[PDB]
Amino acid sequence: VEIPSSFDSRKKWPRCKSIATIRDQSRCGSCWAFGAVEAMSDRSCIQSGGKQNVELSAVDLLSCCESCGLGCEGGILGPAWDYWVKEGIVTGSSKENHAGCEPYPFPKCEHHTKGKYPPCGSKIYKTPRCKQTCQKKYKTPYTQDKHRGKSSYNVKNDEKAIQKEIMKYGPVEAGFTVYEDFLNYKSGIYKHITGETLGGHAIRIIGWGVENKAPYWLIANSWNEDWGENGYFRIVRGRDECSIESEVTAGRIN
Numbered sequence: 403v404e405i406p407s408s409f410d411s412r413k414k415w416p417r418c419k420s421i422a423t424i425r426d427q428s429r430c431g432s433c434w435a436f437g438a439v440e441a442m443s444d445r446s447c448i449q450s451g452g453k454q455n456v457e458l459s460a461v462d463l464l465s466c467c468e469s470c471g472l473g474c475e476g477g478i479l480g481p482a483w484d485y486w487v488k489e490g491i492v493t494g495s496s497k498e499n500h501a502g503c504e505p506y507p508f509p510k511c512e513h514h515t516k517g518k519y520p521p522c523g524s525k526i527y528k529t530p531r532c533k534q535t536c537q538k539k540y541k542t543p544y545t546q547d548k549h550r551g552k553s554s555y556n557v558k559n560d561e562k563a564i565q566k567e568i569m570k571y572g573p574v575e576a577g578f579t580v581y582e583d584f585l586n587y588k589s590g591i592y593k594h595i596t597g598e599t600l601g602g603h604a605i606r607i608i609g610w611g612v613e614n615k616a617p618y619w620l621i622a623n624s625w626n627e628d629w630g631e632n633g634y635f636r637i638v639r640g641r642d643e644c645s646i647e648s649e650v651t652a653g654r655i656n
């Protein structure tokens with residue numbers, strides 16, 4: 403009937419391989435776009451009963467959405483999802499996977515931690531141009547590869563509402579405020595104690611649990627599988643921690 407004390411989208415739809423996928427946005431501020439295309443890829447898979455097994459292109463949205471902000475310099479969550487509805491997004495994997503219509507052009511790197519990939523550093527790339535043509539060897543026309551949703555919406559700033567929204571329809575995108583101490587997160591349930599504000603980050607909430615009495619959101623970051631708890635992090639649920647319950651945005655394919 404109700405909300406379980408714990409839930410994990412990977413556990414309900416494990417056929418949907420995108421749910422368990424951790425991406426890397428590279429030396430680019432495209433978080434806004436990733437949490438969008440990630441939740442959408444999850445939700446297309448979930449909502450069509452499995453028939454929509456696709457990986458949507460972060461670069462299609464990052465570069466072609468004209469009302470979504472500043473590209474590699476930062477974006478708006480609501481319009482991103484609106485772009486998905488009116489205009490749609492083509493397929494595109496990552497750089498080192500080379501798949502789909504418009505795959506990501508930037509290589510994987512380490513975000514505030516030592517790993518396998520070369521360190522990201524602090525340079526930011528210019529927002530790619532809007533292509534409108536697929537990569538040479540993917541033959542489906544750009545305009546035909548567009549996958550659209552039927553609706554976009556903000557979810558209410560409401561713990562229980564966010565929970566039902568995830569369970570019934572899939573992961574949601576959400577923004578939160580980054581304070582300096584987040585850049586030192588390694589594991590555990592994150593809460594802002596110390597540090598100045600640096601900006602906002604958009605991520606994908608996949609579930610929630612409770613670790614000995616302590617409630618949390620399970621969140622997929624997009625700084626590759628090396629950062630945090632194998633890509634994922636956890637943050638205090640229930641108290642609008644860093645406004646994590648304020649900027650929740652999603653939509654549906656039908």
Ligand SMILES: *[C@H](CS(=O)(=O)c1ccccc1)[C@H](CCc1ccccc1)NC(=O)[C@H](Cc1ccccc1)NC(=O)N1CCN(C)CC1
Nearest residue numbers: 430431433434471472474475476477478577578602603604
């Ligand atoms: C992503 C956050 S990030 O992954 O932590 C990141 C990546 C790279 C560098 C720094 C941080 C982007 C970062 C934006 C940015 C780029 C370059 C220098 C500094 C910052 N953040 C966003 O895209 C956020 C998304 C967001 C919106 C609302 C609430 C919470 C998160 N949006 C954003 O920064 N802007 C500013 C530009 N604009 C027109 C509105 C959206």
